[PDB]
Symmetry: D2
């Protein structure tokens, strides 16, 4: 592929504790959902709920330091896992911990 860009940057709050597991190849994987407030206001300020996935030390740092309600920033890519009986999620290659 030529001329392909895919970049996402989000800051939000985890809706619940992150879920850490390990893949068959032993790679740690931490998942979590990020509530990101919208810019505009309707009628009430709605939010968007974005599923994120992290890998290896990134996933391990997430599991140890981030909890429900923690503020976190992610930098990564949009990835899809559509199947037939669509899924979209953020593959976060960097996670910033905005709280101590």
């Amino acid at each position: 592929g030529s001329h392909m860009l895919n970049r996402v940057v989000l800051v939000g709050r985890l809706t619940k504790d992150p879920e850490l597991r390990y893949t068959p190849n032993g790679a740690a994987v931490a998942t979590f959902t990020l509530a990101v407030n919208r810019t505009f206001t309707n009628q009430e300020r709605e939010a968007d709920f974005i599923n994120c996935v992290t890998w290896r030390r990134q996933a391990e740092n997430v599991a140890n330091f981030l909890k429900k309600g923690s503020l976190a920033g992610v930098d990564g890519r949009l990835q899809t896992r559509n199947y037939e009986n669509f899924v979209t999620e953020v593959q976060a290659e960097s996670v910033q911990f905005l709280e101590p």
Copy 2:
């Protein structure tokens, strides 16, 4: 209130769909295939654009055309008629870029 930024460059998988709201707001939708580099080879992102940007999409973009998007990631999740939670993730394109 919180950071939310998406930038993509890919190629439309089909011709864009255009429609005007009864009040005259143009809304155009399309799906961007973005190639990666055993694992998945590409991702397919649904995009939404409004007003002049949407009229540009409909007049200049077709299946296979190269297009770039700059916007935010939003969700429109809902509960279907069968009590099942359905997840909808889309890119609200604030700016659409294309050749010519």
Copy 3:
């Protein structure tokens, strides 16, 4: 004239208190510099500029040491100085400023 994208997103700490000025037409304009840490140089100094309501909020809520997030565009204002040498200016025109300690 077609196919152009310009997007910057940063999180950093203000190295100094923001400076608030007003244009000849009365528009508020606030400037500030962010220290953006890296993963021998430890952080990059990036000059930011904001307008109107965003500038008012920056002036009221952000001070030296405040953590801030910016989303905007890269802009350049290069010129020729008194001695005839070109000097290059790069700054972030922030469309939105997130205050991470309100």
Copy 4:
């Protein structure tokens, strides 16, 4: 670390400049003209495989996409010189 992400799409103003470091690492610099929504002229830098691709694929006026980070750098002139550049992790361009 903190968030620092830049994405640009523009046109090279000049042919890219290919240099090498003492240990043989390729380094390519170029300037992207990005029209405002009048244009901005942003200096970019890339390394190694990406640098080699820039050198033998991009020329004056070529369209190029950049994904990277906003950084500052030091390099003596051929006086101390300080520059603000986009460090490109990936450089995208149109199939030759």
